[PDB]
């Protein structure tokens, strides 16, 4: 009080010195019951994936495709998410969620990169510059390798022009390199382009095919379809908490509700358009939202020249959470005697600490409110 009045003496009265506000603790998060589960499992657990000549730009849309199973799948070698770091792939997807796959020969996996041509990046598959998406190369020897070599994935080893990035090049005609015409019967300048990967058990890890899949993420004016899942904690109640349901965020106290939504609303507003109710995406229950307690604190003093005692009023607050409202455990041991004690009184104006209630009645001395006054009788009485 002395510091806010800028004086070394104070006159009898009631002064307002500061405000206070309860603080959030948990910061919970709730999201829908994801359970949408893209059928990537087969294009992880099939025995014969796409073909480098016939690797379809297969459009798999409208489901959640978790990649955390990829990170902990314990098979990857050259799993690389260009554009966005792989660790931040499941959290945030991108539109144009097109998908690709193949079981490539691993001798040139490092050639499959943005801004890098070569042989596979030339005749088989090229990455566009500034790739936004994931190219994943891993060990798939034990299945795509039969006796004497798994010649199940051929490959175009000859192409007239270097591949446009993201082009599934399929053709039957053979490479042209000379001028003397092939007569259909294979000649000295025919050069059958679709050669065969030798995928033998005799091959090493590099020679054996690394399986590479391509989650390509472009930017077209079409709605996004497939993204990684979202985590979500459990929910707390009757505590000033931070919260973020499926899209909207705030801070407050969540309690049981009595109102009744129609089967298609998500939340609710009031006059002046303040959200005050919500529906939890995983239980279909309506919860009411209440602001965390806040208010002002005032000091009742009988005058410096008379005494040196004070009383404290926390306005319109239930007279129980005062030691948590102000960070009492942070204040000095001399503040701490005014956050609890024997003299604790609940009035229509708030919580009064440091004065004792009395059944008698006198003329008003210091106004507190709603018919309640306080004074000094040698001790502060209310």
């Amino acid at each position: 009080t002395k510091c806010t009045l800028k004086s070394f003496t104070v006159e009898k009265g009631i002064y307002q010195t500061s405000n206070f506000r309860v603080q959030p603790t948990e910061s919970i998060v709730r999201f829908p019951n994801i359970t949408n589960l893209c059928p990537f499992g087969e294009v992880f657990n099939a025995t014969r994936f796409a073909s480098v000549y016939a690797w379809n730009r297969k459009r798999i849309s409208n489901c959640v495709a978790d990649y955390s199973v990829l990170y902990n799948s314990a098979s990857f070698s050259t799993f690389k998410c260009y554009g966005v770091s792989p660790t931040k792939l499941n959290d945030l997807c991108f539109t144009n969620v097109y998908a690709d796959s193949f079981v490539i020969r691993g001798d040139e996996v490092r050639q499959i990169a943005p801004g890098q041509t070569g042989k596979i990046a030339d005749y088989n598959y090229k990455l566009p510059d500034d790739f936004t998406g994931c190219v994943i190369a891993w060990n798939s020897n034990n299945l795509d390798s039969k006796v004497g070599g798994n010649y199940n994935y051929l490959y175009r080893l000859f192409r007239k022009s270097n591949l446009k990035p993201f082009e599934r090049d399929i053709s039957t005609e053979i490479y042209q390199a000379g001028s003397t015409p092939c007569n259909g019967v294979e000649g000295f300048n025919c050069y059958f382009p679709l050669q065969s990967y030798g995928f033998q058990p005799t091959n090493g890890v590099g020679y054996q095919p690394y399986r590479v899949v391509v989650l390509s993420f472009e930017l077209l004016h079409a709605p996004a379809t497939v993204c990684g899942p979202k985590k979500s904690t459990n929910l707390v109640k009757n505590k000033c908490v931070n919260f973020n349901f499926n899209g909207l965020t705030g801070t407050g106290v969540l309690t049981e509700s009595n109102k009744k939504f129609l089967p298609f609303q998500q939340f609710g507003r009031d006059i002046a358009d303040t959200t005050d109710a919500v529906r939890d995406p995983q239980t279909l229950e309506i919860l009411d939202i209440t602001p965390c307690s806040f208010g002002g604190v005032s000091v009742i003093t009988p005058g410096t020249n008379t005494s040196n005692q004070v009383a404290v009023l926390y306005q319109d607050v239930n007279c129980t959470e005062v030691p948590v409202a102000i960070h009492a455990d942070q204040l000095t041991p001399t503040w701490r005697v005014y956050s609890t004690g024997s003299n604790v009184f609940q009035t229509r104006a708030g919580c009064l600490i440091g004065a004792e209630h009395v059944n008698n009645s006198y003329e008003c001395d210091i106004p507190i409110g709603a018919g309640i006054c306080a004074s000094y009788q040698t001790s502060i009485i209310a």
Partner: nanobody
Framework: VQLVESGGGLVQAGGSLRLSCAASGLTFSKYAMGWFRQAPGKERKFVATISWSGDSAFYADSVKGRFTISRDNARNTVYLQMNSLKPEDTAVYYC??????????????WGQGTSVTASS
């Protein structure tokens, strides 16, 4: 080209170690890096990987729980915290770099090898 290792399996008791490598022959912020291991009964088994920028990383199955990686964009150095050593991890570890990252049989340069002996 000047790829060097450090450490040494001097464990007087239960303890850990750190592998400090450095690619002091070429640029350090252009080639993605991986650390591999040689058990006396095994080959240059993959352990850990790390991106060009030192962010993209995903450890092998065996070391995704205890063996931490880190590299620096500058300073040319790189570290692997070999925490809570295991006897199977008594191995000749090679820091190495390549265009890509993660269990590549061929890589640009291999380390000089640190023969860490997790003893009992």
């Amino acid at each position: 080209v000047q790829l060097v290792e450090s450490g040494g399996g001097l464990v007087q008791a239960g303890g850990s170690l750190r592998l400090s490598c450095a690619a002091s022959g070429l640029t350090f912020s252009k080639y993605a890096m991986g650390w591999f291991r040689q058990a006396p009964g095994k080959e240059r088994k993959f352990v850990a990987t790390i991106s060009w920028s030192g962010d993209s990383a995903f450890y092998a199955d065996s070391v995704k729980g205890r063996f931490t990686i880190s590299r620096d964009n500058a300073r040319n150095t790189v570290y692997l915290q070999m925490n809570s050593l295991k006897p199977e991890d008594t191995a000749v570890y090679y820091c190495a770099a390549d265009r890509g990252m993660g269990y590549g049989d061929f890589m640009d340069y291999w380390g000089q090898g640190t023969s860490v002996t997790a003893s009992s």
